[PDB]
Amino acid sequence: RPYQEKSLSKMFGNGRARSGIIVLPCGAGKTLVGITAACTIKKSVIVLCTSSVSVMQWRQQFLXXXXXXXXXXXXXXXXXXXXXXXXXXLVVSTYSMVANXXXXXXXXXXXXXXXXXXXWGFIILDEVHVVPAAMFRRVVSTIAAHAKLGLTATLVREDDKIGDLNFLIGPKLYEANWMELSQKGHIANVQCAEVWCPMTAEFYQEYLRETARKRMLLYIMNPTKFQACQFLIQYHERRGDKIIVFSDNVYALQEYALKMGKPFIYGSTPQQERMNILQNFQYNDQINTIFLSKVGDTSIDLPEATCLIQISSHYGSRRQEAQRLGRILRAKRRNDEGFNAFFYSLVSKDTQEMYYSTKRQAFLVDQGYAFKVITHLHGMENIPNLAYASPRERRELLQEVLLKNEEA
DNA sequence: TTGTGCTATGATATTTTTATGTATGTACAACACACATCGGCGTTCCATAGCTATTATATACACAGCGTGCTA
């Protein structure tokens, strides 16, 4: 990819003594850039990752290059260990395993052999936006190499600590514009859209009488959000496109999941059921609407479903939802003549959550994506299958929300 | 004088996910007495070769049955 050689030209310029951060999309090949840099340096390279799936991907890249089984390419994890050799090495480690404090499973010595014997020379950190934390400062404080590299896709955080990475690892060298990359490769056009649904009177006065995170249980459970949600679901099913529903709250995800009758993936869920739901979403055309929480978004991103719906949201964590949204957008690439990606933000008027979703839309403006407002698409008035459209169901839902407030 | 409001820290309240020690399900073999071993056939059809009854004649000998005399 041209931008990858545009990033490698900086390494080809000076050669020795360099450190910086390279911003590349998730769908791009930053791991290939790490492989090329590993071929240019030829030394013990350590790749800092947070999940085993990324370790398996880096191992697949090592297989795409050459060798992995002979005593040279090592693997560090809490399950097994593998030997290494000087002058050339490729190993992937976990942040929580290298960090620690005093808990030990007779494996911290195996890491202190890679760090004690001084077999290093190249540092690779996956997702640098997570570095602003004490454990990563300890990791950097326990390592020292000749060349450092930071592979990440985003860096927008409101912790005011992203600027420290300019001296902890190095200043950002190349930031690729996702619009020009969309022109190089169709990574699904980004259509940002907020749905403005009216707010009922009872949920408005009860919403004002509530506060903190409890008023979210009155912002999400609005009947017009159920009507507009069903209208968007039936609309996308009529267009023949799969639907992914995001929710920062597990309770709302279970409510919409059970009322819509679709599979759901949330916390404390068996992994076999998660894999079954994933296979049903990949193969079965009857399941075109999935309800995914943060566990289903951080662990895996699927290239299907051009329809992304956002209902639940948390205060301040708008940039993280923009990063996950960006992961689902960049995950969809196949060079199509159309390829229209639709992001909907179900927001209710006069609520305290839309005013942060606007900050998320500001983050979506900083990336160059297109944003437009949507009050209501004509067609919901012709859907007799809408729930909570009658005053009876609205009063019953009001009583259910009041009971939910009495439980919390 | 006493009550009320913002900066900042202090503490208090949520959320996701790594491995870990204990629990649960499932193998394995296996220990040492409990026990074991040892000894100083019936039934039917076809080709085969022997084997059945008879006589003309002499000789001599034994065996079973019948016709006639005597007396009680």
Side-chain angles (χ1 to χ4, degrees):
Chain A
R1 302 306 301 179
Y3 50 89
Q4 300 182 5
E5 288 98 18
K6 295 301 180 301
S7 301
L8 291 173
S9 181
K10 302 178 181 60
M11 291 56 181
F12 297 153
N14 57 329
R16 299 299 182 89
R18 58 177 297 102
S19 297
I21 309 299
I22 297 183
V23 180
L24 294 178
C26 181
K30 58 182 61 178
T31 59
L32 297 177
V33 183
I35 294 302
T36 305
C39 300
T40 308
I41 298 180
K42 296 299 297 300
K43 205 59 180 179
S44 300
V45 182
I46 170 179
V47 180
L48 276 303
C49 295
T50 181
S51 58
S52 181
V53 50
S54 300
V55 186
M56 298 301 300
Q57 294 300 320
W58 279 95
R59 289 179 60 180
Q60 291 301 321
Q61 304 302 325
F62 299 154
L63 296 178
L90 294 172
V91 68
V92 184
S93 57
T94 310
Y95 291 106
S96 300
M97 180 180 60
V98 181
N100 291 323
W120 52 60
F122 193 21
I123 312 298
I124 295 182
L125 301 91
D126 181 28
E127 302 298 82
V128 194
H129 63 273
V130 205
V131 176
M135 57 168 308
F136 305 85
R137 308 298 177 85
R138 303 175 183 177
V139 174
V140 180
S141 181
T142 54
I143 65 180
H146 182 265
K148 298 180 298 180
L149 180 59
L151 300 179
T152 184
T154 52
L155 47 85
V156 181
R157 279 192 173 185
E158 303 184 66
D159 62 334
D160 299 332
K161 301 300 180 300
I162 56 179
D164 301 333
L165 305 178
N166 300 331
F167 54 84
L168 302 171
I169 307 177
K172 45 187 180 180
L173 299 181
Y174 181 79
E175 289 184 322
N177 182 256
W178 290 262
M179 304 299 298
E180 304 299 327
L181 303 189
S182 181
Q183 297 300 137
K184 299 300 180 301
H186 300 78
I187 50 179
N189 301 121
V190 183
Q191 275 63 47
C192 307
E194 289 185 303
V195 180
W196 311 104
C197 59
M199 190 66 172
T200 56
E202 293 77 25
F203 287 81
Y204 183 63
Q205 51 180 359
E206 291 287 345
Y207 182 81
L208 294 179
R209 285 186 288 268
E210 292 293 78
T211 180
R213 61 180 61 90
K214 301 180 290 70
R215 73 192 308 175
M216 297 193 303
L217 300 183
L218 288 80
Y219 154 77
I220 304 168
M221 298 295 297
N222 185 264
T224 319
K225 294 189 61 181
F226 291 95
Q227 301 180 71
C229 181
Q230 292 169 99
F231 168 72
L232 292 180
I233 289 179
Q234 296 180 32
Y235 180 73
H236 305 339
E237 291 296 330
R238 284 176 181 178
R239 294 192 303 179
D241 302 330
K242 300 180 180 300
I243 316 170
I244 296 180
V245 182
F246 307 98
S247 296
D248 299 29
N249 177 256
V250 181
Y251 178 81
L253 191 71
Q254 296 303 109
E255 293 299 83
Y256 283 82
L258 292 180
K259 293 174 186 180
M260 280 52 178
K262 300 300 180 300
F264 46 87
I265 297 180
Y266 63 106
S268 300
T269 303
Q271 302 300 133
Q272 289 74 23
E273 300 180 4
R274 297 180 179 179
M275 298 301 179
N276 184 25
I277 294 179
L278 289 179
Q279 297 304 314
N280 296 334
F281 178 73
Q282 294 301 128
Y283 296 154
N284 296 125
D285 302 333
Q286 289 74 225
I287 306 300
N288 299 333
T289 304
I290 50 180
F291 286 84
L292 298 181
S293 179
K294 298 299 180 180
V295 51
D297 300 331
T298 56
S299 60
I300 182 180
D301 54 333
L302 288 314
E304 303 188 87
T306 181
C307 300
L308 307 177
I309 299 183
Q310 178 71 291
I311 306 180
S312 306
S313 298
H314 185 255
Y315 301 99
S317 62
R318 298 294 179 173
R319 62 266 185 177
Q320 301 300 324
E321 300 179 23
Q323 292 176 9
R324 167 255 299 172
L325 176 64
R327 289 179 59 180
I328 310 299
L329 293 167
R330 299 159 191 174
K332 301 182 299 299
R333 70 279 181 178
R334 50 183 176 269
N335 300 18
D336 299 337
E337 302 298 327
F339 214 173
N340 296 18
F342 299 94
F343 165 74
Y344 297 90
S345 180
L346 295 178
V347 292
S348 300
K349 288 296 184 180
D350 300 334
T351 59
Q352 302 299 326
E353 280 68 277
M354 48 176 289
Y355 302 134
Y356 294 83
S357 181
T358 54
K359 304 179 182 61
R360 180 182 178 182
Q361 304 307 318
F363 297 150
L364 297 175
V365 170
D366 300 333
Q367 308 301 322
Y369 298 152
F371 167 71
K372 59 180 180 300
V373 292
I374 295 182
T375 161
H376 60 81
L377 180 60
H378 297 273
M380 58 180 299
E381 72 287 333
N382 301 331
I383 302 300
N385 302 120
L386 296 183
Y388 307 107
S390 180
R392 178 74 278 180
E393 298 178 332
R394 294 177 180 178
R395 290 185 299 269
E396 297 181 67
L397 183 59
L398 178 62
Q399 298 301 132
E400 291 176 291
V401 172
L402 290 179
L403 291 178
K404 179 58 181 180
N405 301 334
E406 291 176 290
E407 293 179 22

